Scaffold this motif. Sequence first.
Motif, PDB file in Angstrom:
ATOM      1  N   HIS A  92       0.917  -1.136   0.000  1.00 22.76           N
ATOM      2  CA  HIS A  92       0.000   0.000   0.000  1.00 22.76           C
ATOM      3  C   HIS A  92       0.972   1.204   0.000  1.00 22.76           C
ATOM      4  N   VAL A  93       0.782   2.142  -0.934  1.00 23.25           N
ATOM      5  CA  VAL A  93       1.673   3.302  -1.086  1.00 23.25           C
ATOM      6  C   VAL A  93       0.906   4.599  -1.268  1.00 23.25           C
ATOM      7  N   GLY A  94       1.493   5.706  -0.821  1.00 22.64           N
ATOM      8  CA  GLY A  94       0.822   6.987  -0.932  1.00 22.64           C
ATOM      9  C   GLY A  94       1.360   7.828  -2.069  1.00 22.64           C
ATOM     10  N   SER A  95       0.751   8.985  -2.303  1.00 24.65           N
ATOM     11  CA  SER A  95       1.213   9.899  -3.361  1.00 24.65           C
ATOM     12  C   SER A  95       2.235  10.870  -2.778  1.00 24.65           C
ATOM     13  N   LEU A  96       2.267  11.008  -1.448  1.00 21.60           N
ATOM     14  CA  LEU A  96       3.195  11.912  -0.764  1.00 21.60           C
ATOM     15  C   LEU A  96       3.833  11.113   0.350  1.00 21.60           C
ATOM     16  N   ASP A  97       5.028  11.521   0.782  1.00 17.27           N
ATOM     17  CA  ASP A  97       5.765  10.818   1.832  1.00 17.27           C
ATOM     18  C   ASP A  97       5.030  10.663   3.171  1.00 17.27           C
ATOM     19  N   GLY A  98       4.171  11.617   3.494  1.00 18.43           N
ATOM     20  CA  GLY A  98       3.445  11.549   4.751  1.00 18.43           C
ATOM     21  C   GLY A  98       2.132  10.785   4.739  1.00 18.43           C
ATOM     22  N   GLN A  99       1.952   9.884   3.777  1.00 16.81           N
ATOM     23  CA  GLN A  99       0.730   9.086   3.701  1.00 16.81           C
ATOM     24  C   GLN A  99       1.016   7.854   2.886  1.00 16.81           C
ATOM     25  N   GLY A 100       0.215   6.814   3.059  1.00 19.39           N
ATOM     26  CA  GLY A 100       0.457   5.593   2.324  1.00 19.39           C
ATOM     27  C   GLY A 100       0.180   4.342   3.137  1.00 19.39           C
ATOM     28  N   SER A 101       0.565   4.350   4.413  1.00 19.01           N
ATOM     29  CA  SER A 101       0.330   3.193   5.267  1.00 19.01           C
ATOM     30  C   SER A 101      -1.161   3.113   5.659  1.00 19.01           C
ATOM     31  N   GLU A 102      -1.611   1.903   5.983  1.00 13.92           N
ATOM     32  CA  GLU A 102      -2.982   1.651   6.402  1.00 13.92           C
ATOM     33  C   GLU A 102      -3.040   1.767   7.928  1.00 13.92           C
ATOM     34  N   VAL A 138      -1.405 -11.652   9.161  1.00 11.73           N
ATOM     35  CA  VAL A 138      -0.756 -10.773   8.188  1.00 11.73           C
ATOM     36  C   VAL A 138       0.293  -9.959   8.904  1.00 11.73           C
ATOM     37  N   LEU A 139       1.497  -9.988   8.338  1.00  9.81           N
ATOM     38  CA  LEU A 139       2.650  -9.267   8.848  1.00  9.81           C
ATOM     39  C   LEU A 139       2.752  -7.893   8.134  1.00  9.81           C
ATOM     40  N   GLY A 140       2.503  -6.800   8.858  1.00  9.48           N
ATOM     41  CA  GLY A 140       2.578  -5.452   8.291  1.00  9.48           C
ATOM     42  C   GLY A 140       3.892  -4.765   8.638  1.00  9.48           C
ATOM     43  N   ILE A 141       4.545  -4.180   7.649  1.00  7.94           N
ATOM     44  CA  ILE A 141       5.857  -3.542   7.830  1.00  7.94           C
ATOM     45  C   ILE A 141       5.798  -2.143   7.187  1.00  7.94           C
ATOM     46  N   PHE A 142       6.042  -1.107   7.981  1.00  2.00           N
ATOM     47  CA  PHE A 142       6.031   0.259   7.468  1.00  2.00           C
ATOM     48  C   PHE A 142       7.294   0.549   6.668  1.00  2.00           C
ATOM     49  N   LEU A 143       7.199   1.518   5.760  1.00  2.00           N
ATOM     50  CA  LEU A 143       8.326   1.961   4.935  1.00  2.00           C
ATOM     51  C   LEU A 143       8.514   3.442   5.194  1.00  2.00           C
ATOM     52  N   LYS A 144       9.760   3.829   5.440  1.00  2.00           N
ATOM     53  CA  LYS A 144      10.094   5.233   5.649  1.00  2.00           C
ATOM     54  C   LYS A 144      11.279   5.512   4.744  1.00  2.00           C
ATOM     55  N   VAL A 145      11.343   6.702   4.164  1.00  2.00           N
ATOM     56  CA  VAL A 145      12.469   7.053   3.288  1.00  2.00           C
ATOM     57  C   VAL A 145      13.802   7.104   4.050  1.00  2.00           C
ATOM     58  N   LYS A 208       6.922  -2.677  14.695  1.00  2.00           N
ATOM     59  CA  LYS A 208       7.192  -1.343  15.206  1.00  2.00           C
ATOM     60  C   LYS A 208       8.269  -0.628  14.358  1.00  2.00           C
ATOM     61  N   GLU A 209       9.312  -1.343  13.952  1.00  2.00           N
ATOM     62  CA  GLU A 209      10.384  -0.736  13.174  1.00  2.00           C
ATOM     63  C   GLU A 209      10.147  -0.764  11.672  1.00  2.00           C
ATOM     64  N   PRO A 210      10.026   0.429  11.048  1.00  2.00           N
ATOM     65  CA  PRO A 210       9.816   0.449   9.602  1.00  2.00           C
ATOM     66  C   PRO A 210      11.141   0.122   8.909  1.00  2.00           C
ATOM     67  N   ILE A 211      11.043  -0.310   7.662  1.00  2.00           N
ATOM     68  CA  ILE A 211      12.242  -0.576   6.888  1.00  2.00           C
ATOM     69  C   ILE A 211      12.413   0.710   6.087  1.00  2.00           C
ATOM     70  N   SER A 212      13.632   1.016   5.683  1.00  2.00           N
ATOM     71  CA  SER A 212      13.831   2.222   4.899  1.00  2.00           C
ATOM     72  C   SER A 212      13.855   1.928   3.401  1.00  2.00           C
ATOM     73  N   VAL A 213      13.460   2.921   2.614  1.00  2.00           N
ATOM     74  CA  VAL A 213      13.485   2.830   1.168  1.00  2.00           C
ATOM     75  C   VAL A 213      13.999   4.173   0.676  1.00  2.00           C
ATOM     76  N   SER A 214      14.778   4.159  -0.399  1.00  2.00           N
ATOM     77  CA  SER A 214      15.318   5.395  -0.946  1.00  2.00           C
ATOM     78  C   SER A 214      14.205   6.152  -1.644  1.00  2.00           C
ATOM     79  N   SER A 215      14.433   7.447  -1.829  1.00  2.00           N
ATOM     80  CA  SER A 215      13.478   8.294  -2.522  1.00  2.00           C
ATOM     81  C   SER A 215      13.255   7.757  -3.943  1.00  2.00           C
ATOM     82  N   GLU A 216      14.335   7.246  -4.540  1.00  2.00           N
ATOM     83  CA  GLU A 216      14.281   6.693  -5.899  1.00  2.00           C
ATOM     84  C   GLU A 216      13.386   5.468  -5.947  1.00  2.00           C
ATOM     85  N   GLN A 217      13.517   4.567  -4.964  1.00  2.00           N
ATOM     86  CA  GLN A 217      12.639   3.387  -4.925  1.00  2.00           C
ATOM     87  C   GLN A 217      11.158   3.831  -4.764  1.00  2.00           C
TER      88      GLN A 217
END
Length: 256
Positions: A92-102, A138-145, A208-217
């Motif tokens: 699940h992904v957002g259009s802006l960095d501050g949104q996207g997670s459920e 279901v295993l949910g994992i947050f993504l942060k840049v 609790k711990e999000p995984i990181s993703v680059s801005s490019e990803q």
Amino acid sequence: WGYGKHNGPEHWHKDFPIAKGERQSPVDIDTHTAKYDPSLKPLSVSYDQATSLRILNNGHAFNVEFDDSQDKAVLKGGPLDGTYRLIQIHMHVGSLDGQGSEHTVDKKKYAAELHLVHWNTKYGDFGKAVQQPDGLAVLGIFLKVGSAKPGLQKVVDVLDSIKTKGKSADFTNFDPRGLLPESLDYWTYPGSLTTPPLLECVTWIVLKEPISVSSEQVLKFRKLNFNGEGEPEELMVDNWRPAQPLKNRQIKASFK
Ligand SMILES: [Hg+2]
Ligand SMILES: [Zn+2]
């Protein structure tokens, strides 16, 4: 159903009245009212011999499908009784960095949320499991840049192949272990699938711990389309259902 104005989350209840049920997902995780449970066994993620199969854009998300014919990539322990087989991974992904997670943490939204769907082996198969109140985990994992996530790059590199609804590609030899953060601390509560049919069969384990993703990803993950090929382009972004009323549920935490 979809995520637009006329088929989005606010319309779901008409076809799937369970949308207004007593244990719908996702929910906001209030970190202060979450009950630490020192009696939960450590969560066991054995993705050791996972067997990925194909990746597909079903118009709602990219979905990596796995061979769940026997115990290959399983989830055990924690709040779980028994063994749960990995069947699929989507984002699940957002259009802006501050949104996207459920799921949200103290109302905070992450740029995206990966869901690793597992079903209870005491039921035979996925179809049977979704008729049980404890059939899925279901295993949910947050993504942060942050820094590029090697495990997500595998997905990134095939996104053009499956740009539009209905396109699928071979996705064998994908190790789902590369999508996990260092820590397995989690919050857990009884919920539902977050997309129709929204069946209330799941034991949610939100890390609790999000995984990181680059801005490019992140940008590449927002280049998929909801539409089928040849139709007007509708970027697959904001494909998330908002937090649902917690009703009388209790969210437990595996950490202090
Ligand atoms: Hg169910
Ligand atoms: Zn999901």
